[PDB]
Write a protein that binds this ligand. Structure first.
Ligand SMILES: Nc1ncnc2c1ncn2[C@@H]1O[C@H](COP(=O)(O)OP(=O)(O)O)[C@@H](O)[C@H]1O
Ligand SMILES: Nc1ncnc2c1ncn2[C@@H]1O[C@H](COP(=O)(O)OP(=O)(O)O)[C@@H](O)[C@H]1O
Ligand SMILES: [Mg+2]
Ligand SMILES: [Mg+2]
Lengths: 166, 48, 595
């Protein structure tokens, strides 16, 4: 069934969000074993010390420090795109909408996960957000690469939709 | 991470506001740890 | 007896009035007007604290921190000048920068007592305007003479005085009876109001704070409940906080309030106070110049919300609604509408709410509502309250407040029948009728409407008729003057172009538009011309007798819509009559919206 059918409200509400994450519970022997090992390790008390008390020495942050750092960055920085990022974003958006149009005209039904301008500003906001945490007043195509990868990973799992197939 | 950081807002000469916050939705089956993520975000954000 | 400090301060303020010549000619102009036109203007002028600051810092600080010692001298000096220059005593008002003395009811504390302050907030409740007896006059029948007496109280002077509680005289000094002469006595108006902290500034979840303000004479009815107001006055205390006599109780303190002297209404979004700007000769010249260009309509249309791509016809319609037509009142007592209404049905990412919020931000008087946000008594003012004097009264609603303005409704299709029947009368008769227990009245609700709606199936469908896509009563659609349908069809070139536009944004100004609209609405009232009569008649006949399937029905409301649109376009043109071009433009817009 289409993702629109799976939800219990008007499908236009999905048009408001920037990123969507349909997480499925697939059964797998090795993954089940790994998650079980992780959970019993947490309950026993090793994960309380291991990793958490060793990654705090260089490769992990405290919760209070992270909170303060978020406040700092929010107050201080406000990035802005660069022309290369702008043109790349424009081209990607046009290609995505072209593909969706072709799929829709190939059939008589409309997709349940539409693509609109909101997604354009969503990618814009995502790239600027990635730029901000580095405190860089300017964002280059390296940020747009990651932004598009995140978008494809999250929102463009609308390929599970029926017209989108093709 | 991108959500907590947030985008950049723009105020235009005509009065229109281009928002800079990010919205995210989580579809999934039961028992995928998508409520603990919300709880952690609540505990780690300055205002939540 | 005379005081030397008082006289020195009077002399210094007279020097101040001498160095600056604007207030002098202001007083002269008020006196000239009152002499020539006899309406009577009140004897008052406004002073700038900034100029006082450059002139004499000591006197500035004295007025700011010790008004009770420095202001009466200034009023006496002003009165002396006024009495000397002409062929009631005068009062003063203060403007400029108050520095640290600009506060709100929450941040007004006991350390500001006896000093001049300026507070901001929302008016919550006023009082009945009452007369106060100042001088009585009497008559003795046995002797044929007239007498009088004067009365005073603690709030008529800034400095403390020894009380003199005079009694009301019924007899003469020789025992004879007296008769009251109500026509020869003197009464002064009086009111009391309450000011609270603004809803858009007070902390959330916390109970608010408020302060009382006392007004007298010529500042008695300058605001109504719900307004945003700025009041400048003296924060003062009165009486004895239980000190006199034993008065074992210690919980109460000293009564405090503000003896106001300046009241300024402030305009905000979604409020009942309308915005007005002062028009200078430079502005008038520029407006009257731009009136003579041929693409003036195009420029004014493209100026609206330049951040949105396209929707040119909706921009034109919004401009036409902003300008408006003319309403007619026949001697018989009939009324003919003159407002314009707009509706928008479109796809769920077509920037409907952006244009709606633009209209909210730009109109001089607008109120924003949403589908289920306000209902029942919240729209027609159908709620009843009562005074502590006993009487029951009404308080205005969304559309009652927005009389002579515009109302923005979002999620229009989410309403119900109970309020749609209510809004029928507003949209056609432009009146609100209430009949409850102890009330029978009729309120004026002359307002225009702009709304946005969603299609039934989430997205507009071209394989079905419009009736299956809009799903709204026909009688309701007949009351909307224009209905627009907007759809987003994927197109490589259009998507590209809108992409570069949205990227440009992310990396004529409004004030001149507001001035233009205000001048045009206030000054111009065109008349109908035979040419436009023929054009509109032909167009109405053709539309009524055509086989095309429309987005809305055709009635006499369409003919009246044609007249209204033509008159509004002529109003844009600053012309005193309607020509053929305005009628043709109205017909073209109506045909485009319909087809
Ligand atoms: N992938 C996972 N890794 C570690 N723990 C998990 C995982 N998935 C579920 N859990 C466990 O399940 C609990 C969270 O369940 P819950 O928040 O109810 O999920 P949901 O909100 O999706 O129903 C946690 O206490 C956690 O220990
Ligand atoms: N024609 C357009 N021009 C510019 N921006 C647009 C246009 N259409 C949509 N958008 C963008 O998409 C968003 C749509 O938001 P909204 O006004 O709520 O649309 P709707 O009310 O139709 O859902 C806006 O933030 C706006 O920036
Ligand atoms: Mg859960
Ligand atoms: Mg909207």
């Amino acid at each position: 069934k289409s993702p629109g059918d799976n939800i219990d409200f008007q499908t236009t509400i999905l048009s408001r969000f920037d990123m969507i994450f349909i997480v499925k519970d697939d059964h797998n022997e090795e993954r089940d074993i790994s998650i079980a090992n992780h959970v019993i390790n947490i309950h026993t008390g090793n994960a309380n010390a291991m990793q958490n008390q060793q990654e705090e020495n260089g490769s992990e942050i405290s919760i209070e420090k992270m909170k303060r750092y978020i406040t700092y960055c929010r107050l201080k920085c406000a990035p802005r795109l660069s022309p290369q990022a702008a043109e790349k974003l424009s081209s990607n958006f046009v290609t995505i909408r072209k593909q969706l149009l072709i799929n829709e005209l190939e059939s008589t039904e409309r997709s349940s996960i539409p693509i609109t301008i909101r997604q354009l500003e969503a990618i814009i906001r995502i790239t600027e957000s990635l730029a901000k945490l580095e405190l860089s007043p300017i964002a280059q195509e390296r940020h747009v690469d990651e932004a598009i990868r995140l978008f494809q990973a999250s929102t463009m799992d609308a390929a599970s939709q029926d017209p989108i197939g093709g | 991470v991108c959500l907590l950081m947030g985008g950049s807002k723009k105020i235009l000469p005509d009065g229109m506001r281009l928002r800079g916050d990010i919205n995210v939705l989580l579809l999934g089956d039961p028992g995928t740890a998508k409520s603990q993520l919300l709880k952690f975000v609540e505990k780690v954000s300055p205002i939540a | 007896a005379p005081d030397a400090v008082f006289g020195d301060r009077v002399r210094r303020f007279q020097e101040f009035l001498d160095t600056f010549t604007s207030y002098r000619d202001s007083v002269r102009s008020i006196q000239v007007y009152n002499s020539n036109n006899a309406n009577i203007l009140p004897h008052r002028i406004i002073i700038s604290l900034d100029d006082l600051r450059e002139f004499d810092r000591s006197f500035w600080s004295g007025i700011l921190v010790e008004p009770a010692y420095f202001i009466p001298p200034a009023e006496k000096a002003l009165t002396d000048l006024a009495d000397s220059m002409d062929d009631h005593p005068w009062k003063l008002s203060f403007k400029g920068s108050f520095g640290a003395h600009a506060l709100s009811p929450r941040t007004l504390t006991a350390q500001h007592l006896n000093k001049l302050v300026s507070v901001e907030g929302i008016v919550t409740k006023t009082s009945l305007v009452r007369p106060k007896l100042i001088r009585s006059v009497h008559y003795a029948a046995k002797t044929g003479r007239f007498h009088y007496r004067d009365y005073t109280d603690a709030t008529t002077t800034l400095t403390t005085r020894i009380p003199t509680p005079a009694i009301y005289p019924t007899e003469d000094t020789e025992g004879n009876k007296l008769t009251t002469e109500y026509g020869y006595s003197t009464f002064i108006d009086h009111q009391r109001i309450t000011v609270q902290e603004m809803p858009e500034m007070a902390p959330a979840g916390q109970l608010p704070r408020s302060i009382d303000v006392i007004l007298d004479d010529d500042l008695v009815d300058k605001t109504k409940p719900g307004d945003r107001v700025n009041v400048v006055g003296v924060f003062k205390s009165l009486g004895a906080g239980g000190m006199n006599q034993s008065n074992s109780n210690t919980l109460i303190g000293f009564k405090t309030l503000i003896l106001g002297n300046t009241v300024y209404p402030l305009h905000a979004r979604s409020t009942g106070v309308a915005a007005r700007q002062m028009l200078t000769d430079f502005d008038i010249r520029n407006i009257n110049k731009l009136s003579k260009k041929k693409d003036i309509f195009d420029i004014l249309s493209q100026s609206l919300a330049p951040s949105i791509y396209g929707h040119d016809h909706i921009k034109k319609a919004i401009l036409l609604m902003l300008m408006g037509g003319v309403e007619k009142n026949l001697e018989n007592g009939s009324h003919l509408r003159g407002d314009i209404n707009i509706l928008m049905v479109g796809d769920p990412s077509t920037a409907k709410s952006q244009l709606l919020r633009f209209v909210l931000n730009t109109a001089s008087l607008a109120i924003a509502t949403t589908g289920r946000g306000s209902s029942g008594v919240g729209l027609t003012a159908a709620v009843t309250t009562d005074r502590e004097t006993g009487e029951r009264r009404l308080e205005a609603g969304a559309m009652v407040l927005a009389d002579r303005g515009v109302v923005c409704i979002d999620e229009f299709d989410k309403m119900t029948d109970v309020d749609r029947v209510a809004i029928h009368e507003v949209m056609e008769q432009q009146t609100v009728t209430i009949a409850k227990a102890g009330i029978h009245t009729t309120l004026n609700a002359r307002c225009s409407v702009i709304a946005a709606a969603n299609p039934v199936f989430g997205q507009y469908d071209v394989n079905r008729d419009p009736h299956q896509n809009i799903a709204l009563p026909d009688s309701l659609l007949s009351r909307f003057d224009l209905l627009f349908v907007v759809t987003d069809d994927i197109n490589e070139i259009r998507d590209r172009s809108i992409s570069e536009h949205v990227l440009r944004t992310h990396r004529v100004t409004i004030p001149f538009l507001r001035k233009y609209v205000q001048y045009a609405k206030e000054r111009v009232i065109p008349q109908l011309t035979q040419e436009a009569i023929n054009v509109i008649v032909k167009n109405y006949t053709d539309l009524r007798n055509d086989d095309n399937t429309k987005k809305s029905p055709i009635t006499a409301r369409t003919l009246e819509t044609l007249i209204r649109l033509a008159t509004a376009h002529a109003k844009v043109r600053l012309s005193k009559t309607v020509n053929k071009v305005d009628a043709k433009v109205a017909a073209n817009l109506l045909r485009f919206a319909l087809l």
